[PDB]
Design an enzyme around this catalytic site. Sequence first.
Site, PDB file in Angstrom:
ATOM      1  N   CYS A 152       0.813  -1.211   0.000  1.00  0.00           N
ATOM      2  CA  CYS A 152       0.000   0.000   0.000  1.00  0.00           C
ATOM      3  C   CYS A 152       0.850   1.267   0.000  1.00  0.00           C
ATOM      4  CB  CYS A 152      -0.968  -0.041   1.186  1.00  0.00           C
ATOM      5  SG  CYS A 152      -0.219  -0.077   2.823  1.00  0.00           S
ATOM      6  N   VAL A 156       0.093   4.129  -2.730  1.00  0.00           N
ATOM      7  CA  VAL A 156      -0.293   5.493  -2.377  1.00  0.00           C
ATOM      8  C   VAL A 156       0.648   6.500  -3.028  1.00  0.00           C
ATOM      9  CG1 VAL A 156      -0.593   7.121  -0.494  1.00  0.00           C
ATOM     10  CG2 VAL A 156      -1.441   4.807  -0.257  1.00  0.00           C
TER      11      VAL A 156
HETATM   12  S1  CLF Z   1       5.220  -2.012   6.691  1.00  0.00           S
HETATM   13 FE1  CLF Z   1       4.060  -2.458   8.588  1.00  0.00          FE
HETATM   14  S2  CLF Z   1       2.878  -4.274   8.002  1.00  0.00           S
HETATM   15 FE2  CLF Z   1       3.467  -3.300   6.051  1.00  0.00          FE
HETATM   16  S3  CLF Z   1       1.529  -1.964   5.251  1.00  0.00           S
HETATM   17 FE3  CLF Z   1       3.292  -0.837   6.454  1.00  0.00          FE
HETATM   18  S4  CLF Z   1       2.555  -0.737   8.623  1.00  0.00           S
HETATM   19 FE4  CLF Z   1       1.568  -2.473   7.541  1.00  0.00          FE
HETATM   20 FE5  CLF Z   1      -1.285  -4.249   6.094  1.00  0.00          FE
HETATM   21  S5  CLF Z   1      -2.317  -3.307   4.327  1.00  0.00           S
HETATM   22 FE6  CLF Z   1      -1.078  -5.000   3.378  1.00  0.00          FE
HETATM   23  S6  CLF Z   1       0.249  -5.638   5.120  1.00  0.00           S
HETATM   24 FE7  CLF Z   1       1.381  -3.946   4.017  1.00  0.00          FE
HETATM   25  S7  CLF Z   1       0.411  -3.956   1.960  1.00  0.00           S
HETATM   26 FE8  CLF Z   1      -1.026  -2.290   2.685  1.00  0.00          FE
END
Ligand code: CLF
Lengths: 522, 522, 477, 477
Positions: A152, A156
């Site tokens: 994500c 973004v």
């Molecule tokens: S580094 Fe850490 S775990 Fe990664 S997103 Fe960022 S805070 Fe979360 Fe949750 S939603 Fe899925 S896993 Fe990621 S790609 Fe978008």
Amino acid sequence: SQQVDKIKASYPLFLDQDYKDMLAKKRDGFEEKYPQDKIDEVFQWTTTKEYQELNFQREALTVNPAKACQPLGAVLCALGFEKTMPYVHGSQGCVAYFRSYFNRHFREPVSCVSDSMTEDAAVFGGQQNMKDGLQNCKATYKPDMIAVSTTCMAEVIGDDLNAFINNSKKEGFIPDEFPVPFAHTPSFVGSHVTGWDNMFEGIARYFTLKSMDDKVVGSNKKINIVPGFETYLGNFRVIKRMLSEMGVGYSLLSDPEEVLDTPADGQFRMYAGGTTQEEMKDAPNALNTVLLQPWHLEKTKKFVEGTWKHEVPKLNIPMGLDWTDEFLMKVSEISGQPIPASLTKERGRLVDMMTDSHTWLHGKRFALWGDPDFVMGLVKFLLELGCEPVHILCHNGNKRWKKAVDAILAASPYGKNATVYIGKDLWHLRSLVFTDKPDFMIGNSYGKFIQRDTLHKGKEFEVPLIRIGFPIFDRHHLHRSTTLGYEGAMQILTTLVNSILERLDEETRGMQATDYNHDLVR
Amino acid sequence: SQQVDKIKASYPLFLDQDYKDMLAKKRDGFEEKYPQDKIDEVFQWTTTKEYQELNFQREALTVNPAKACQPLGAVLCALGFEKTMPYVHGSQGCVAYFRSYFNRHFREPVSCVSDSMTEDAAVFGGQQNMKDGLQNCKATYKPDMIAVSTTCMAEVIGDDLNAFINNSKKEGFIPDEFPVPFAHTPSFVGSHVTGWDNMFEGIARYFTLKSMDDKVVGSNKKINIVPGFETYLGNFRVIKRMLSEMGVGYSLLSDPEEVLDTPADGQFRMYAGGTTQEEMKDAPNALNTVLLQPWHLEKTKKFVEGTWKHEVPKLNIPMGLDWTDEFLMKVSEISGQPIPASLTKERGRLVDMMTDSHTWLHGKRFALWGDPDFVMGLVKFLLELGCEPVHILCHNGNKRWKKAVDAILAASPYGKNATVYIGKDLWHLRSLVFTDKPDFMIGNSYGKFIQRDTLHKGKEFEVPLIRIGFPIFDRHHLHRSTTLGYEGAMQILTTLVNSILERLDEETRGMQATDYNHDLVR
Amino acid sequence: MSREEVESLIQEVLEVYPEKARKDRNKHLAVNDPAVTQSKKCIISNKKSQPGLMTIRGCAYAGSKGVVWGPIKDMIHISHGPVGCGQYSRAGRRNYYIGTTGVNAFVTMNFTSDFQEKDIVFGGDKKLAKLIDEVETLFPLNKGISVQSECPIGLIGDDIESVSKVKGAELSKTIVPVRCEGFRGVSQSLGHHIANDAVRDWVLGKRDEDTTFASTPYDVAIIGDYNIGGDAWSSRILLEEMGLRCVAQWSGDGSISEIELTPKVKLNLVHCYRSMNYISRHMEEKYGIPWMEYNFFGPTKTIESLRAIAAKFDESIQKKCEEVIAKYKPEWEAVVAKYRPRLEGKRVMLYIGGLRPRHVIGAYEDLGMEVVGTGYEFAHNDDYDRTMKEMGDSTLLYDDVTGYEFEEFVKRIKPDLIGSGIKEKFIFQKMGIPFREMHSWDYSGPYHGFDGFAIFARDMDMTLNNPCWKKLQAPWE
Amino acid sequence: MSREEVESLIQEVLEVYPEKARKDRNKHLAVNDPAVTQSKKCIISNKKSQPGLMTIRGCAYAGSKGVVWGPIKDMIHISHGPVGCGQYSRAGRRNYYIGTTGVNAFVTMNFTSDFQEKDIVFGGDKKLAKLIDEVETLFPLNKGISVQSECPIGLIGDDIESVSKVKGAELSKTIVPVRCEGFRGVSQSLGHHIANDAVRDWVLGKRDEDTTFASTPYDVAIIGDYNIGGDAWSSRILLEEMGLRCVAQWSGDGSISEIELTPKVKLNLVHCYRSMNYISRHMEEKYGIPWMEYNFFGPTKTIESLRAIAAKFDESIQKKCEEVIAKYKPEWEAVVAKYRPRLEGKRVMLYIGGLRPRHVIGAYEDLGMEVVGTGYEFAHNDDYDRTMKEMGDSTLLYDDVTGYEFEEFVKRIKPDLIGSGIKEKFIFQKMGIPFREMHSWDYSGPYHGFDGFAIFARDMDMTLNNPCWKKLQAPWE
Ligand code: CLF
Ligand code: ICS
Ligand code: CLF
Ligand SMILES: [Fe+3]
Ligand SMILES: [Fe+3]
């Protein structure tokens, strides 16, 4: 205190008197805990219908969801190809979670890499990360193909995958001819099965979009099989076995069964089996292509019909009697190969088990959840058994899928008390099973907490859990099971009927109270 | 009273207040029942060590045995041949019981006939019954072979099978060329597996004793496989599949898997599959013969070595890891066919599951019973798991078998707390599991009562039942399972580890009391 | 002992990488010399991981939500953003607690905002306020809300601090915004830092003006123990057998009232330096509370820690400490007598997160087990300063190791046992080498304290002497 | 009517057999004529089975041990002989009871002498005495012992009557020898007769001189109801709602004291004529107790039976009977309204050993179900005399049918439902015809009484209208 001859782990070590006194002193002194009567009152309130009405008015909060994000499905799809590394462009915590989550489910090594984008990439992007990561991964783990998904973060910030990979190739970080398919997998759109679909469509587009000129439909006398997001090895095994018994040439695209079931013989195999690049390049020469799970393979269907010019059959998932029959008849029609006697014998055996277990299976009430195709196949199968689904919930389902499931329910008198829920989570289902108590639940490990809650209301209110789906964390080696075909229907029936019998034995085990019905023979 | 929308069967209908008042009035008025305090006192006494000492001094009474009589095994052996009718010379009630008992286990039709001997035969014998029964059976059900066993009636009166069948043939009741093998199966000697051995030895002697002049050992390049008394179809299937994967020619003598697993496709097939008369006639031309269960195939071994001149290998039942390895190496040596890579991969996968579930399987205490070969294979496998069997009981076992099991126990540090019992019944085992409580039992459905008794002592004293063996009456379709080979070991491991996990979830489901250890992941 | 061979192996393993990655990874590998006290001269740590080398590190959200804030049982923690994060982090860490799940305790549940396209495009502050109102409606007996940000929260221009302030003032509720976006920092350690900063800013100072809590000269706070498998409990009993009174434990089985009561204690017993030293130093600066580190892994470290802690107090506490020592001596002596002979001389390699790699070595040595190599995912140079004097000469040290590097090290050194996480377990089980998970403890435990030492010994014996490990080679090959 | 079509079918089925078997089997097959009240002119029964035609009949041991004596909960029944018998008969029949198994109740257990070669050669009287002593030792709260002989007992000249007398005098215990060897008679019927004779000889008359039992003018005894799945219980409540008092219950959930108290009742309500008419006639002859038959299968028959029974007493019992009728009318009317439309016009074939093939007809007709053919394993000519008035004209009758005969009859007639035992179930399920076990009620029930009618209707509907039966033909054939 511990006795050396009989050592106790946390349970039941913390049931000792000194530990209970410690916990009581802690709670009474410093936790400022609510009185037990207030807690009981609030729990009883949460088991009510008014609480359910409040719960289903939710618009902003999600409690205990039943879905994952896209890059997980993208990684699962990527692992199904020969010597292919899943490469997730974005942040490393995502990859850590994906790896640990698949490790807990499959209990096998799962390989995936990230480019470890940080706060610097938040203003500059991830060109440098992409170049260095591709070079490092290729030099270190020696894979034949790198399949790139996104987190994500990069979604973004709008990182351009095609431009990044092209700039990596033209500057010599990776060879020009080296296969690097890519797919955008935004986690705020759809769910993990959508990521699987995007990854597979990206790989297919990479290998066959630019070489359609010399392709002739049906010239290799095979059938392309696209399974979709699949976490049961037995489904891959049963589809291959059923195709092979028919004497039908086939190509199974994105086949991860070998890499997730490597033998323990003193060495680590990071890669094993999978779909070859030659198979993917030759797929447009097949007679047709079958999607095993059409309801999350729509983009792949659009690509295959639009570009490969394959007339994709309108088939449901081959779950249960009628849909397995339809799948096999469609395969026989497309390949021109008659259905053999062994498959007839297996179908007869499945029918025989149905008639043997029908008396115990009749009228039982089930709540159930999972991915759309698995859910609809299970509902169709339960209707075929004389069972009554009541709460059918798919967090990642859509309105068209809901309409099709409603049409399936209307075709059977046993679906008269069934309601289909999309966009709802497991807390909604907890309310549903409290206010309209069913006999059993069918779902993944997350349902066990719900069972706990029901058992807290009373033994007569407890709804037993049956673990079919993904993920399965608190049991061992259930990922080896099969749910597709006659063999899958057989295992599902055995599991359901024996769960009912086990519950009946538990209810009638009381000496001189209920053991009058504790029959030797059932 | 019944509500039409929710009808109750006996449970929980008889828990209603009016029925409870009725039962209380009946008991207090006319049953002259012992006071509840005396009943509780006597039960508590029966759970003690002094009661165990009294129980193991028994010499004349048998309570809840774990064995059957010979003609049952004779019928099971007879059903393994093509278009062969089991014919039991004696009384018809025995046939009724055999048919009902196999029907309840296999949940399939089982065909067998009697000659219905009565007091008149008790005075003058059963020549007339033999003649009329053979004629009637041949004319009515049209089988290719009639396999004759005996009940205890004819055994006591000393009916001569050979003379009766000869007189039937010479007087024209049945054709002279028509195959009628016979075996004496006295129920007061041995058990059902002894009847299986006698029946098979009789059939082999009938087909090959008088035609050994033109037989050359090893001239057909096959291996004779004698499974013995076997009530799991998966065992026949896995042995056949494993032999086929190696590319090894084999003959499976007395193969009943087809007749006990016929399709339900609108017609009744009284016969299906089985070993052909040609196969039995050609068996002495094989390279060798393998007995899968040598400890109840001793008479067959004597006949095969003394007459066929086959050097029968000294092999244990192929159960678990080491013994499957030995069986396959012996097959490779005798046939000259190397062990294929698929079998290597399957063995590695079983090793992988072992190392995955070892932490939960370590140190668990088990009491088990069954037939000697199955018992010793399960004991060996439990040693291979790091588990500790404590009560090993075989009602139909003998002293030499007990020494063999003791020698297996001494070879492993995990058998240091194990005791082998021969000639004991399930009441002895109930005392054993009360006085030295294990973690689980492995046995047939008769163990469920024992579980009930333990639950009556308390939840902390309850010993859960694991249904592996024969007969299995209160569960559906477990006869389709497999216990032999790597596949059977995999299923056994899955069953054991998931039973342990299920018990752990049950003990840890109490909210705010034990639910601190109710982990999502195990 | 074979010191020259160790760096030769390091060089041969280094050879495979490209020049930039090789130069970077060369600084994270070292040969231990216990005489060295400054670890910066041998090993570098707390740096960004190299792209595409399959690191083990997590993110800042894991360090904040999954480690520090999650164990707080009576608060509700909202994973603000897409659905994946809280789902993958739900109930993965055995942070034990006592409570009524769904009524007064919310640890094993996954509260999330579950962003879709529209929330990315137009922001998610309004939906955050609506979610807070819904949380208040359906979970009335919670005692506070935390808002753990995921990556899009920081990427798009959300401002949850103002929403938290407004909603907390409106609802008279403690709402804590935590900017723990996964792209911040290089690992979970910055998540620890951000969580501690949020704790001081929004929770710690609630009862600064409140003097109604009656205190005693024997008041301690257990900081940095997350009750993994009950670990914290097995520590607490010993402290209460020594005559101490524990107001709070951070943060396993912890409550917000206990955190608020922490500034009233007389001593801060810090177990995990790496995740809680920030708040420990803040408390020493602001409230004058002294803090000391202790080790409850193995009988030797437990005895030393108990004696030091009692030395921080008067003579009665010291006498009770000696009584506790004498009471528990025969039990762990019996454990050693039963299990030490079956594990003498075996060699272990550890790769764990920020504390345990150096902090469980004494328990292995109590069993006559030698640790030949250890490493951290996300530790700092001070952790290595402690590590070098804790480890032996010519043993391997390694920071943020890659899968390839660690596999090669294990192939060359050939240890009897390996202790690491779930992402290495099956890799090294298929290699034929016994493996113990050192995070969830293979879903067993607790291991802290005297009662935990017996379980630790039993588990190590059962895994290393397992008959499965002698069966991976087929007899025909 | 197609009476000729049925006789022609009988002849064609007859054709296969040899001459002797054909001549014998021809007398056991018949076409029903309700105007005929003398069944001997139409059908023969209670004869030996032809060898090798796969009969369904059991033995005398099944009739005595498995049917009459086994349900007695507070006594211990020893299967005297080899091990097979009691093992195959253990807990196969759902004769329900209330008690503590192994302490005061022994129904589901298998006590046996388990003869070996030496017992056969030298006899088993000493082993029997030693077994009785051991039974006394390990089961002190038993209230009597029965000794059920198997075939070798009668074939080797064992005298268990003398052993029973001696041991009973020694131990002050009731010991009942039963000569129920499997080769006496032709079926379970002689087992019933022998069991009734044993009960008369050793149990019935113990309290003939005892007058301490207080009796009422409303005393009845339920004779020949074995509480199959609770059947007897569902009857007793109705009798209790009519104002009756039931002293004893033969023999499901029965106790020895109930049998001893039976000679003190005012009326003997016999459900199973076939298995208990002997003792009913004996009690009428000796004690002057009148006995009458009743039928509690379905609302019509149970209403008629309740009215007929209440006609034997004063007007208060009649008023209570009418009250019970009015109370239960809406429930079974609702059952009919729900299930009769689903089962109108369907045809059933029955084959059960005695009494039930005729009593269950009325319930089927109340559901608007036509019974087009019925038969018994071991009934006598009196049973057929009672039978022939209850079936339709030109319906099929058949005694001790063979598997071949019954399969051919089912193929020609093609019924919608078949009710028989476990040895026919899977045979006719694989043919695609719904099957209900009418011995064990397919492990459901009870079926007796108003409460049992709802379960009966639900079971018939669930099996006949099952969606599985429309799926045996695969779509490609
Ligand atoms: S580094 Fe850490 S775990 Fe990664 S997103 Fe960022 S805070 Fe979360 Fe949750 S939603 Fe899925 S896993 Fe990621 S790609 Fe978008
Ligand atoms: S908090 Fe840290 S990685 Fe100190 S993030 Fe990690 S429950 Fe580890 S070595 Mo998992 S700094 Fe705790 C830890 Fe140690 S989650 Fe646990 S085991 S003692
Ligand atoms: S007709 Fe009846 S059931 Fe048959 S024996 Fe006779 S009493 Fe008994 Fe028990 S032991 Fe086995 S089954 Fe028989 S052959 Fe010897
Ligand atoms: Fe694995
Ligand atoms: Fe069947």
